[PDB]
């Protein structure tokens, strides 16, 4: 479908999406960094049961969960569920088989593009250093 997607795509819903991105672990109300991550990434609507990540795979991809819920799973056993505002994958092959619990919207990025954004943000770099305690 695109009902969720449609709530977010186009110049029309640019604000709502940017607004959404800021309320993420990594962005932490750094707007410039979202506006960049907005441009860098591709919105995807995901059906209930739809896999964004096979585990054992080498997807450099990392998804911002903008709306809905993702069920992390390892070796057959449910782990966490990430939700609106969180992210999935990395920061080695793939840890977990992430899948969608209900309709979910994500923003998909490549490790590569991600870090050239990462690496230019004093703000993010500062925030990853603070969380580096043993």
- CATH number of the domain within which 66 lies: 2.60.120.10
Beta strands in the chain (DSSP E): 42-46, 61-74, 77-83, 87-88, 99-110
CA distance 41 to 109: 5
Contact (Cβ atoms closer than 8 angstroms) between residue 38 and residue 64? no
Q: Give the method used.
A: X-ray
Using alpha carbons only, give the angle 33, 114, 96 rounded to the nearest 5 degrees: 120
Q: Is 11 helix (H, G, I), strand (E, B) or coil?
A: helix
Q: Where are the alpha helices (DSSP H) in the chain?
A: 3-6, 14-22, 31-40, 111-118, 122-130
Domain residues for the domain of 74 are 3-130
CA distance 10 to 29: 22
To one decimal, the resolution in angstroms is 2.9
CA distance 21 to 24: 6
Say how many CA atoms lie within 13 Å of 57 toward its Cβ.
15
CA distance 126 to 105: 28
- What residue has token string 């994500």? 106
Tally of structural domains, the chain: 1
């Amino acid at each position: 479908m695109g009902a969720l997607l449609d709530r977010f795509s186009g110049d029309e819903k640019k604000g709502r999406l940017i607004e959404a991105v800021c309320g993420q672990d990594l962005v932490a109300n750094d707007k410039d960094l979202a506006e960049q991550i907005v441009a860098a990434g591709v919105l995807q609507e995901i059906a209930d049961g739809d896999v964004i990540i096979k585990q054992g795979d080498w997807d450099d991809d990392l998804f911002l969960i903008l709306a809905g819920k993702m069920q992390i799973t390892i070796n057959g056993r449910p782990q966490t569920v990430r939700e609106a505002g969180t992210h999935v994958g990395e920061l080695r092959p793939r840890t977990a088989t992430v899948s969608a619990i209900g309709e979910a919207l994500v923003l998909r990025l490549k490790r590569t593009v991600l870090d050239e954004i990462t690496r230019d943000s004093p703000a993010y770099l500062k925030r990853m250093l603070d969380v580096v305690a043993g």
